[PDB]
Amino acid sequence: TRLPLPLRDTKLLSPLRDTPPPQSLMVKITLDLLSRIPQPPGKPMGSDKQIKNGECDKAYLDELVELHRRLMTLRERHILQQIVNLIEETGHFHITNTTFDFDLCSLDKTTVRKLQSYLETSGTS
């Protein structure tokens, strides 16, 4: 009677998928305070190549991580349009009528440099 296993946190999760995507940090901007909602895609379109990258453990991640944050503390509008459209031109973002995110660690490193830039119009330091 609950002698061996008192009580676990979470039982069996969804159908154990085969080597499913990893886990890290993603950027999600409330769909409410967005206003603009990019139109959905046309044809399914789904590659299969997926080049095996090698982020490896380093430190540069710190930057990307911090970014996601400073992004959450954004409330000036007008810019969101420059963050959604910019990527729009290049798929790789999940859209939803109630949420929308994307991965900045996937697209070229240039896209990240641009974003960070605007995210600092004033003049930190």
Provide the pairing of β-strand 27-28 with 93-95: unpaired
User: Solved by what technique?
Assistant: NMR
Residue with tokens 């009580």: 7
Going by C-alpha positions, the residue among 106, 119, 111 that lies closest to residue 26 is 106
As a whole number of angstroms, the distance between CA 93 and CA 27 comes to 10
- In the 8-state DSSP scheme, what is residue 57? S
Longest dimension (CA), the chain: 63
Q: How far apart are CA 48 and CA 53, in angstroms?
A: 14
Domains assigned to the chain: 25-120 (1.20.1270.290)
